[PDB]
Amino acid sequence: MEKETGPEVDDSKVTYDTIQSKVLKAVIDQAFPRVKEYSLNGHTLPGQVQQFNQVFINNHRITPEVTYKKINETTAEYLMKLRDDAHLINAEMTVRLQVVDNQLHFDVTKIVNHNQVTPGQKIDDESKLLSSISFLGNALVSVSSDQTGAKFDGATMSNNTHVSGDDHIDVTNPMKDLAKGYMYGFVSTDKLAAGVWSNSQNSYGGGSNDWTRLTAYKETVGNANYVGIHSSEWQWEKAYKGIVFPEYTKELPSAKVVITEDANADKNVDWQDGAIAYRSIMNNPQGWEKVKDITAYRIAMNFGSQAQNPFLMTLDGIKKINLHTDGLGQGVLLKGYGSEGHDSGHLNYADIGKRIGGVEDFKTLIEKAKKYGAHLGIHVNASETYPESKYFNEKILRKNPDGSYSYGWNWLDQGINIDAAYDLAHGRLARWEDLKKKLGDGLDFIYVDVWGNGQSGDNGAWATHVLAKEINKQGWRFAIQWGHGGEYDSTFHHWAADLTYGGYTNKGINSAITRFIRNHQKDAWVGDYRSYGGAANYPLLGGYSMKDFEGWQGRSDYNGYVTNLFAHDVMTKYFQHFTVSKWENGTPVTMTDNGSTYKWTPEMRVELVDADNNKVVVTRKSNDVNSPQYRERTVTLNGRVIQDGSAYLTPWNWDANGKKLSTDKEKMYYFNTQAGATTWTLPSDWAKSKVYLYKLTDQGKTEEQELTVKDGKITLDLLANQPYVLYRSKQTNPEMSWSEGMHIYDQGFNSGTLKHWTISGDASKAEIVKSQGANDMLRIQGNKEKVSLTQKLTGLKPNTKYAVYVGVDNRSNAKASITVNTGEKEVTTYTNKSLALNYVKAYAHNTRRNNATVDDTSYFQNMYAFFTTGADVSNVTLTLSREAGDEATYFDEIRTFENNSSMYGDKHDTGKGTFKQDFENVAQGIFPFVVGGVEGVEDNRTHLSEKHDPYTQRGWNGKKVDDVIEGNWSLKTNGLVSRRNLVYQTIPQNFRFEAGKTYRVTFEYEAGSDNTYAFVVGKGEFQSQASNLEMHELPNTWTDSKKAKKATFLVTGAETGDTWVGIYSTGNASNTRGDSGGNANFRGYNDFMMDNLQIEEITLTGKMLT
Template sequence: MHRPLSRTTCATLLSAALLVLGTIPATAAQTAAPTTAAISSGTLSVTVDTAFPQVRQYRLGRGTLPGNTGATPRVSINGTAYTPKVTSTVAADHVDYVLGFPAIGVTLNVRLSVSGSVLDWKVTGVTESGATKVSALAIPGLNLLSIRGDQAGAQLAAASVYKTYYAPGPAMDTIGAVSSLPVDSAPRHKVIALVAGSTIAAGVTSNSLTSFSDPVDPNRGGNLLVRTTAAGGVNTTSVASDQWTYRGPDGQVVALPEAKVVVTGDANGAGGVDWQDAAIAYRQIRPEPEQAAQTKNNVVSQIAMNFVSQAQNPFVKTLDDIKKMALYTDGLGQSIELKGYQDEGHDAGHPDYAGHYNTAAGGLADINTVVDGAAAYNAIVGVHISDVGQAPRSQAFRWEKTDNPTSPEAPYIYGDTAYSLDTGKDLASGDYAKRIDALVHDVPHLGFVYSDAFFQDDSVDWNAWKEADVVAQHGLPIYTEFPTYMFPYTSWYHDSNEFEDVGINSQILRFVYNQDMDAWINNSEPMLGGEQNKASFMGWHSNNSVNEEISEVFTNNLPTKYLQNFRITSWKPGDIRFTGGVSTKMNGSSPQIWRDGALERDGDKFFLPWSPQGQEKIYAWNDAVESRTWTLPKAWSGQTSVTLHKLSDTGKDAGTPITVSGGKVTLHLDANTPYVIYPGTPVSVPTTGDLSDGSNTGAPVRRTDTAASVGFGTGTIVRNGEFFTRDLSSWTRPPPPATLPASRW
């Protein structure tokens, strides 16, 4: 097979031939080669530069957006700028470039390709034939996307992440007309950037690992560089990628540098184009946390606490508590964190992740008992680790890994003295990965890893990515404490779930990621809410009220999770629309949920199908004793009778038949009490998307559990030792001794 000639080679041969024929003058031969080419997917057309891997223009339908409007940039390798020798080969939907850097013996292969509505800019190969090993790659001035302020409807919507510590942080969004944006003296760091005109919109993403590096505010950050400049009285806003980390401090290749641009028109059918259309399209290319699909099903979130050698919550007791919660909620999804699974309990023995288990609470065998047993009740169980401190009593402790080995200081004493761990050194050494590997080997069905207090000065960039990636390599999600560290690799922030006013303070990011993570300020948008776990009865902060936990789950978490099963398509003040015919609105101070024209929530009164897609059953709750009529979902049309079950910690009661009249049911409920409604004939609606059936473990949504069937006391020597069945059914007396009359036994 003949190797295709590069565009540069073809142009040279053509020019030479025309010179021989005398068709063009010799002075013009050197400039005759075209410098642009058009590639197309059939949907999106992109004009690219053939002399350097950069986009000049995007065209979708009648709409256009500029790419890089500036000069051809240089390439920075390991902090030094070079001008490469470039050749290119053009195909219908892509252009391949070879960038040579002979002075350092490095060659980069880059491909610009288009598929559907996405332009992919990717380094496809790095060749190092000399002593130089590529660690960092940057192309300052390579604007992937631009928009001029004089373009009709020109708009920017961009958000940065912000370091928080028990506080919400300032607003993270910039949303405004390009013509009105202030001119930037230097690029601003953003984690998401969307632009829109009147007929076309686009978004950019990159796999750069940069997090907090904004030149104006070092607490802000993101891996995109957004800058507004002005020339001739017209503003232009451009978006570029920040520096890529090709090889990390451990000497291992991270990933081939890549950026993507997605282009769209009217994505939500609203009859116009703005940043929200770009946000919808951006979901196609968004960086997604590992196992993000679990988020929407984790309705119950609790922390089982063991502390200072007391074993307040033995692991087998936690399994009983999971069963109790499954009965009380008819199997709603649970996410349970074992805090203090190691050594003597919480914050003892860090950073031992395996081989140093809390024997007083049951040890490794009982950890596996609760992790494995929880799956049948739609519960995932994870553990609390730390990679920022190390205790001298831990097996992993090394003086040389403290932040200041010559004069180490103990930063905190919380049950056990701990010294600051040099996280970067620990990650680069491979020791962190070995400890995670050992943990997953010992607990093969682990549900997640929670990395505590990951907010140090070095909890950024490659360190944050590596901390999460090691866990993700096992197919596990990683959670952490403080927003917005480890974004976008994590799907759960502890502070967002414990405090109502702490979390990611961004409408743009919530629009895109609402379904993917529990990271939001709970009280910032009552229509959407936000998961909370502060009421837990498993010992965190000494909380022990089942009633408070049930109230939080049903009045706060369940409506939040219901909406997370759908994706936001439009967000206006007082009115948010979703896929699936779902919307949420404000009725005075009360949030409402509507679906297909029927009211499903009115403040703390609701009638919510679950799973939200499958609609196999319906949860009902009322904040007052009253009769209320609800419209059955469309999927329940044809039902003539349903059964209303009252829920308690022993499960569903026998149920009360309710007659359906005109597609509606009238319910008389006790106040602040959960109910579940089952149809007269089974309802089964096809679901789409990962884990959209309401279960993260494969456990059925329609439950047949009873207090007798769940088997309280698994892993102990006594069945039903806590009398969770509310009776003595598991307890029998042996026959009386022969020397004792039966009447006295």
């Protein structure tokens, strides 16, 4: 390539001025808001050397009529009139250039459109709007090839672990063309660096063309190439289908430059110096400060009306984790906080889940959790909804060009995407407001699922920023799914933090530059997942690795969760208490994985600092990719080693909320993924002190042991993958107030004792034991007389109706009971041997081997009593008991909560009388049925359907059957046809068909096809040697009827006491009558709904006999 040339500059008709601070001088054109040149400590950076007196308004080239006025020694102002009648532009804008110490600020302070535009109202011509304002062509800062050390360094979005998003370019003549959007961008010489910020929400496309708030351009001027950094275009007045967006969607354009000398004392001026300084001019995502102390992220799940994780239970999880980490901070994402749970009732953000305890319990959760540094988030959706939802309306739904619905997710119900732009223009904000109003303060984060994939239309930079603003404005912190989403505002990205998702192309932001800048502000990065290669092969800064134990994707592994925290997350978060100061790459390595062989340049040393001048140095132990040392690091704090390879002894001087700890509370964590002794040098403030070590368990600090200090050092030879904590004085564990708010103490058996129960019988027969998932359970076995455990139920309301259940898994034929005595009345419920495996995937006690009760299975099901308090609640008792038996009964989780069911002879309390279920006041699940094994252990596709006329009912979008038969609730099964298996069943503990007694079972039902579903009668444990069922196949309810059909069956209780009834998915094929896809799922061909179940004991007379 030949030495390049361009026009020289004739500034003969230009009148320049200057504005300046004490350190930075800027020469500016009086004709146009352009900076010719910057000067600092006698060094120079050019700006836009070649005048370019145009802008672009709605992509029309405009020569503005400009008037100048210097305001003070640092500030100038420009009024800029904009006229183009051919394109209906008639407006003006005021711009200010202002120097502030070493920063240059560019602000459009004011915009007037002389065309009539009312935000919120119709406009007849969208071209009358002032939509876009572009100052491309006027570089805010640049560097010339004639200057020593001239380079440009910029970041683009990359989520592929193999591909860096960063460009590093020498500015030379000649050099390759450059016209490209960037997220972050820096120019420098050997003397000065500059960085540029803009609030432009410009996009040039997806992927690495998105989040392109800056634009870098090479321009050739005389005999030099210049690389300048411009703000990309800004957005202003916008509409959707003629409706102008709200005023809050308009943000005044703004950009800033910062110019610096060597800022990390490495005696070199480069992009890093600019990145350090850039932190003083950049946007900071709201709530970023909290991130560094949220060490324990996870999800607590509810789904399909089951209430797997009530709000108050979640607080017990928080307390376990508080103990096991010794006060590390926590972030719990409540997936299914609303409606019937996860993927129910979307868009009605304020509809907090009633069956998990509603808003009252949620508030109590948030409040009590503060002291444990536990922040709560919720999973919401702004892209799709279901007919059940209050906000399902035809006007909001997304249609395809041909008029068809753009169908969304299908699982419990078939959803339909919404038009996000339409939603924004029609009151979206108010939904967030309703939630804030209802819930009050203290919620940390909103996690908006799905947004960023285009289901709802445009989900790009502009729309994401508007959305994020709606949420931030209520006081909430923003979180997103995708690695590539909400770059301006997100603090957390699910697909970055859960390393397992998506594979090497869909992880966090693979940009040295971007992580240097914002590592401490968010979890959006590439963590350690060797199989993805490149940046994911042991990043020196770690990167959040998220695991779960409260039901998300069937995850239940508590211990794994805790060992993961210490293995990845403690050091990850440690670094987030500092800002990166220096970043050193080593030599390119070759790697092979995921089908390619490729070059990767790894980071070898990263330094960080804090406001107290503490210095952290992280060093990779080798640059040889095939050496074990490539995946090892040393970390030093002010010169002292705190990690080396597989082990670390890290100080931690922050309580759970991140507050500086008092001196007597400073501590150190030890963790080592290997066996073997490690030896460590203590800091001077520990070296002459006694030192005690504790092993951290779910019981807190254990196994106190004073350590021997020899020559300022300690030596630790302890269990691998086991956390320990070190103090300079003897520590104790506090009272946790287990299950506070839940009317009983320690409902989940996490307190390590039973002393708070009053035990009748041989107490040696009752023990706390661990499931195969290390879930602590009450076990009663080997007992020759009745054994009982009793507590008062405390803090109840007088004259109030209640439900209480206990999870029970009975391996004995012995009666196992739950009994409530209110002081004026006694009620009891029992089970003999359990006969139904648990198949609720988000429930902690499902039958998956790794969280099985015993013998690789779980029959846990909730066993209920229904009672009503009197005038006096001082002496209400709850009793768990077991009659004599050799085998074991396991009990876990006692939940007492308000319920207005009227199931027994039209009365609430457990008693005699006809059993009715209208599904209008279910406590949780699908009682008296429990989900069967038709889909195995799963987010079961049977739930309680909620009514919304007309959208859930016959006729709407051609729907064939009603979601809801009477009242507001029915029992619905979605598309579970042709499975030859049991969908759900009763169980003796929920309803017992007494030996030899005869019952009439009646219900109303809807069914989309003939003989897809059948009412069945069985006994004992069902097996698909398959079990005998009395089978009654059921016809469709709509071809020859306008409403649900009524069915009636006689059932006689087997002598074994273990008769049950249910619904079975036949092997017959369904009939979608020519419909397919979304239409077919929506309209209900493959559906079954039950309502108004009744079971009456009867004596066979007259015609009942025939």
